[PDB]
Amino acid sequence: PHTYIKTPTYREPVSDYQVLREKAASQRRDVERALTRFMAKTGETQSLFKDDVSTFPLIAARPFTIPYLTALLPSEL
């Protein structure tokens, strides 16, 4: 075969619903954890424990001037 043979095959795709659910879930969890840690580190922060910024940082609660606009309104429409 090597003398004159060529196999133009494709690439086996991933159809595993289990590992695709796991990949999408873990990527969403990791990007939301990275986003919330970045936003809690570069702003005012609270903490459930005394002087706890590295582990479980909370974004500090800021008051709105009009709170029903950020509560009731839909953001994806």
Partner 1 sequence: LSNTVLPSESMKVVAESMGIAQIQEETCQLLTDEVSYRIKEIAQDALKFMHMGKRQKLTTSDIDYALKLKNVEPLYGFHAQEFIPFRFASGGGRELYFYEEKEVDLSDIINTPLPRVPLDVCLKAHWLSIEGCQPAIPENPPPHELSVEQQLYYKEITEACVGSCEAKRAEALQSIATDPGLYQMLPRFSTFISEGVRVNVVQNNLALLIYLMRMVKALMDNPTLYLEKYVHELIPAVMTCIVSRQLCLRPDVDNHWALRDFAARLVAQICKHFSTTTNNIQSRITKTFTKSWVDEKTPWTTRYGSIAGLAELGHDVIKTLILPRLQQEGERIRSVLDGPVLSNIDRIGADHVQSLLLKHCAPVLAKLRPPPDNQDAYRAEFGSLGPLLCSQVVKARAQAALQ
Partner 2 sequence: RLKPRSIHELSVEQQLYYKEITEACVGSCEAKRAEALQSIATDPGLYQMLPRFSTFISEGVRVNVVQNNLALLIYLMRMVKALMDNPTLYLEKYVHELIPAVMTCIVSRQLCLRPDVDNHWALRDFAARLVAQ
Partner 3 sequence: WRYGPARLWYDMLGVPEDDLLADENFLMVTQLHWEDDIIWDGEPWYSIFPIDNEDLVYGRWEDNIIWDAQAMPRLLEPPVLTLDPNDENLIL
Residues forming contacts to partner 3 in the complex (CB under 8 A) are: 11, 20, 23-24
* DSSP conformational letter for 28: H
The C-alpha torsion from 37 through 40 and 43 to 46, rounded to 10°, is -160
Choose between 15 and 75: whose C-beta lies nearer to partner 2: 15
Q: Are 59 and 39 in contact (CB under 8 A)?
A: yes
Binding-site member from 16, 20, 21, 31 for partner 1 (CB under 8 A):
31
Q: Candidates 1-9, 25-33, 45-53, 60-68 — which segment interacts with partner 1 by CB under 8 A?
A: 25-33
Which stretches of the chain bind partner 1, using CB under 8 A?
26-32, 34-35, 37-39, 41-42, 75-76
Which stretches of the chain bind partner 2, using CB under 8 A?
1-2, 5-11, 13
